[PDB]
Hints:
Distance between the termini of chain A: 63 Å
Keywords: Histone deacetylase complex, nucleosome, gene regulation
Number of helices of chain G: 8
PDB class: gene regulation
Radius of gyration of chain A: 20 Å
Number of strands of chain G: 2
Number of helices of chain A: 1
Structural class of chain G: mainly alpha
Shape of chain G: globular
Organism of A, B: Saccharomyces cerevisiae
Order of helices and strands of chain A: EH
Distance between the termini of chain G: 38 Å
Oligomer: part of a larger assembly
Shape of chain A: elongated
Largest sheet of chain G: 2 strands, antiparallel
Chains A, B: RCO1 isoform 1
Strand content of chain A: 5-15%
Bound molecules: zinc ion
Largest interface: B-E, 74 and 77 residues
Order of helices and strands of chain G: HEHHHHHHEH
Entry title: Composite cryo-EM structure of the histone deacetylase complex Rpd3S in complex with nucleosome
Amino acid sequence: FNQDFKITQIDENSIKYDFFDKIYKSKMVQKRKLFQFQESLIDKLVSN
Amino acid sequence: KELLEKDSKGNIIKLNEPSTISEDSKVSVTGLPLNKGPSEKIKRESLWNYRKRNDLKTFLTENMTEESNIRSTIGWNDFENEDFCSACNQSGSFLCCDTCPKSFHFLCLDPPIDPNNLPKGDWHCNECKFKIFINNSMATLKKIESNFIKQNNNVKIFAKLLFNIDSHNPKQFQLPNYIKETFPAVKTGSRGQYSDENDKIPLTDRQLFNTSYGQSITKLDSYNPDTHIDSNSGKFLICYKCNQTRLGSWSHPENSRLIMTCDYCQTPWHLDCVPRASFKNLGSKWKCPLHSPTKVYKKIHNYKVWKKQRLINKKNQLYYEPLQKIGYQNNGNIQIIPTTNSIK
Amino acid sequence: MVYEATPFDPITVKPSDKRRVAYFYDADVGNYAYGAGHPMKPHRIRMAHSLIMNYGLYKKMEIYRAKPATKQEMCQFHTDEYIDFLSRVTPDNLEMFKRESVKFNVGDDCPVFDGLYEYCSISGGGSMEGAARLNRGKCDVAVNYAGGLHHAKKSEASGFCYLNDIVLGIIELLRYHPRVLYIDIDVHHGDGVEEAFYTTDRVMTCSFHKYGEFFPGTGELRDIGVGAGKNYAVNVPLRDGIDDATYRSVFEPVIKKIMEWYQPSAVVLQCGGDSLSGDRLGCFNLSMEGHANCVNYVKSFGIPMMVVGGGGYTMRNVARTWCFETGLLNNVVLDKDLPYNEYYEYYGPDYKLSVRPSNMFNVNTPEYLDKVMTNIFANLENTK
Amino acid sequence: ARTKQTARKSTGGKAPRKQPHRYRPGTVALREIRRYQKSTELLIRKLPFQRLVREIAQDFKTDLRFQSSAVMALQEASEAYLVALFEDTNLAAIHAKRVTIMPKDIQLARRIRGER
Amino acid sequence: SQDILDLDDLVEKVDFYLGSNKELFTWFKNFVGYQECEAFGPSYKRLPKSDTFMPCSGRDDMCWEVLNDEWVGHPVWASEDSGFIAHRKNQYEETLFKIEEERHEYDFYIESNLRTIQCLETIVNKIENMTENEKANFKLPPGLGHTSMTIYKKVIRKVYDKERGFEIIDALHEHPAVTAPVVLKRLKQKDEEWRRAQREWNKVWRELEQKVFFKSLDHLGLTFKQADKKLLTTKQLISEISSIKVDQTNKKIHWLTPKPKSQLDFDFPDKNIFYDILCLADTFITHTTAYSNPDKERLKDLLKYFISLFFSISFEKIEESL
Amino acid sequence: DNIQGITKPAIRRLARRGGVKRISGLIYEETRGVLKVFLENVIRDAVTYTEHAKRKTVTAMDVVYALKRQGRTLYGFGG
Amino acid sequence: KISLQIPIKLKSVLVDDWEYVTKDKKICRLPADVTVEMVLNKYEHEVSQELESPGSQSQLSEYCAGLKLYFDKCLGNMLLYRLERLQYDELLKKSSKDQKPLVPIRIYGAIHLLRLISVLPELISSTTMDLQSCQLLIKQTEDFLVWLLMHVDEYFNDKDPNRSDDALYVNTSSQYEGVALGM
Amino acid sequence: TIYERLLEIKQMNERVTKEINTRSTVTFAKDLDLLSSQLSEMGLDFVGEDAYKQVLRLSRRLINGDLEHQWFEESLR
Ligand SMILES: [Zn+2]
Ligand SMILES: [Zn+2]
Ligand SMILES: [Zn+2]
Ligand SMILES: [Zn+2]
Ligand SMILES: [Zn+2]
């Protein structure tokens, strides 16, 4: 089955877009989860 | 030859010295026996010219030595066979077939034979044993094949496969050619071992031990400035990290930094910019740090591994161009195409 | 900014660091010979010892003959089958052990001579008794040149080494000391000792070795130990022709950082003479001063140490450097005029104690050693 | 059970240790019959021949230097001896309805020559 | 970008890619958001738990705790099945090793024989001072009461015949009363003959050591003449200055805006060395024959004039110093 | 092995000068032994003559002298 | 001439097996967490319900049983490299210790079954088998091979022995190397 | 090149001169003639003279052809 080892023909601009997209995703998911944990800890300290 | 001349009552009287001259003149490392000194033929070039106190303190040790047993664990705590195996085609200690010119390794047989529990009288190979079994039986080969097919009525299609491998001698498994030809980078070594593009061409003994004293494959015993200069261009091999070529000056050869080239992209690297002490003369091909890995491990946070697909010959390798440009989950196995003002 | 190019200072003893020195020598060790064409010679031990007696060094130290190790005591590190094969194999019945010859790597490059078991027993007993005398406080420095077999492993003989006596000595040290530092200045990597204590933090194995396509091939800088022994196996890869100043400026910062970071309770120092210039198999350019400066520097820390002599395949140079190192442990510097020994004809043409370095290229550049020591110092930050 | 040893090594891993136009067969052959017959230069490369003499004289007397003209005398004499013997062999062959010198053809020639 | 490579290895790869560009690799270092285990190394692999379970009888709990039995390494694995490169040694070093080998052979054999003589003479002086009625049943244990059990066996198996050495050892163990003095006498004769041969060989070994040793210790000097012929040419001297200029121009575009106006720097702290080179050149002019006498004298004042004009040395100082 | 230095193509060249058109393959190794034994006859006598002059070096004169003894005179090298 | 259409994923799995055994000097974990019977039984239990033809069911059970018998009789002969023959020897001695004969069905993993499939056409061409049986056996082997692609992530996984004890391959010892490739 | 080669010799001339002049041979080698003399006979040793000046004289002799290359190298080494 020759279709299993198909080599993807990608370009430089698509790699640039994908790298930028994924670093922005990673940076803001860790930033937003840090913000959510900070808000949760603030609520925990307020309730306690 | 009557070493101890015992008496009539068995008492010892006198013994006779054996033949000292039997090995009194054995050749030592000097080329002469220890009985004699050097000959004149070697005294000519050894000596500069050839014409035709006992105050030792080393005997006091035995006395000044005190035994030591204070450890915590003290006390207790015809035809000649062949020189290669018929199964793996490699040299070693063989068990030789008697009525057959083939030789097999002790571990290569079925079942493997212990090198201390050998067969007492004769040993035949599987093919030879099948030959004696056929010649002893009156019926021909196809009769026994048909009888084995009919008796093993449970399986019919594999019955001819089951019958014929009792006659085949055991052999080491080798991948067939059509599994190897689909990967052009994959080669076969001299012993049948794996070999691929990440393997150097083995250096002959003419290069390792048949070279001059100052010039060594290691390139560490002398100042060699004909390594910073490209052979086919004549320019200077600029190291990638330091952006310099430290050729030296032959008046200060300690100012010369060793440089090697990558075995894949020929990118020249200093021996200090990438931390390395060897030149990678033999073994696997040296890979510069700039190449993308073919195997990586990532943490799950177990783990996950990824290996790049092997190279496939052009008749069975399909290169396809994605329609989706952004976010296309490729397996990491990609190819870069050239980029053809609005996009900027 | 870690490596500093410093000229080789002269060797000076510390009069405030007097150590009780125990010497372990069995007169029999030398009567064993690996083969006819073989480089390893146990005869280098007794010409080294003949230099100890004729220098009058026996008046400042105690000479002991250690009890040879039995079968089990060797099995503190090695398997039962390997010691059983070693104690039974002779050059006569070599054909009776062919599977075990390739199993335990004995027969080629580690030949079978008929005093093999006794030689290994002498070496292991010397190492274990030196460690035991260090444990009970009977001595501060234990000297045993009969051993040094650092290439031997759990079930194999490699590198002219059959019984890894250094592992047995470190094992005997670990019964009384929590942290034992092993320093290997042999030009080959201490693969057996490092492999034995790879996964433990109780033993830090430091090896200053040539790392090229050289034996044993192990000893990459990235080899720092696994499991609980991570960053507890320091490997210092060196190139050919390292001189005394370069080796000193590599050795002293690394060992100093290990001393003030790992803080060991006992030290095992492998004094391989194949690190000397002019060795048959070694490729370094150390003089006898350069070889002995490591022993003098490790002596300055005051830690109870076990000086164990390893390689060295030119007998004269290794004997002279072992005599100088042994004299250095008694806080004296032996004069460079050899006394009359029974092996005086070896040390021509000057018949002095010094081992002269060769004029070959010190290809260990300061940048490479700076990077090596920077990564080594970075790995040592987790050993507090 | 007969056994033999071939590895000849007590231990493995010894290395990792511390110690187009084409003429018909014969036309070119006759052409360089003519070439080596019209020629007079010396056909056994010299050095190799000189060596043959050193390793073979060694037996009769050690340290025997040879004047250069001598090893050239041995060459000439040897090439003359072999070209005479090879003319005779070709004859001893063309005798038996053939055109290929064979060992037997020269064990005979030498018998009739009486050099045996 | 495919969630395959980890951020740490990506930062390491970019560090290997843009290390010298400090400003760029910082943009990325942070544009990315990297904040500053299981490093096994290349030369160790882990055995399964089946191969670990091998009986070591001497091991206690501490030995089983501190000793590694799962991670192993071998020279064959580190060689990638290829081999090792031995260090190249001079032919003088090889013949020095041969001299040492012969020395070791003689000394090993002589000292083993001397140790056996000492043990046998202890046995002999023990057996001389007792009468004959119990001398018949007096036996000797293996090792002859010595710390070795094989050294005397080696000496006997060498001195006597191969097949007769075993039976002489058995006769010495069973009946030492007759076999001990003759064995001691033969060993002493072999000792003195071996020592005389060793002294005669020691002369030869010492003279070859004196002939060989300093050339053996010379590494760069043994090949300095061909190296100086090859490397003190026009091409290499052009290559050195051109390589330094290429380095300077390559590093000029990155930093060091005041680009230097020089490539090679030569220091001349001593002035007498000029007179020494002038004397050596004058000696070569006087000795040589391929140059005519007018060409010789023009060479002389050309060298003197160039040295006096290039440097601060005067012609009067050159004339009074040479 | 210095004998194997008398190479095949050289024996072929000798056959060509000798007028042979097809050389068996087993000839090449017969011609070595015959060559050796012959040289081993001249050079033997060459040296007897040499150690009669108490000379340690051999001369071409002694070589043609040994040939004269064997019978096959050689003109062009003295005597 | 007999040809087999093995997918290139399984071809690469076989080539990686060759790499691990000969170059990396790795043997298989024996017995595997998934044996060969276990694969020839799950494939039968998966494609048995894929169609309702009883003759096809008989042919499928025939092929599976014949493959099992062929695997047992041929594994000791020609299915394993020179390195793994020592492991085969120790398995045979361990089986003889407890007096149960060694059957390769319950011991060896699916990679050796893939080896048997890959070497199978040469065995087919070496016997007097008629064209119909060869064609149908090749067809059944091809169907088993394309069944293996749908489960290639659960039989042929990629795991470092230095990191995971549950890898399909194990690193070897120097003593095993010496006995396997030294005598 | 010549001046650097000679400057390496002259910059260490005082220490090598003090080392050669203060060469205290061992006693048992003098009593048993175990020390060589081939380099003292030929006046190739550097005793009693300045080391750099002796290097200059030896090199002048080597240039003039009255001194062999091997003996010059052996004396220098
Ligand atoms: Zn047979
Ligand atoms: Zn085999
Ligand atoms: Zn660089
Ligand atoms: Zn590269
Ligand atoms: Zn070593």
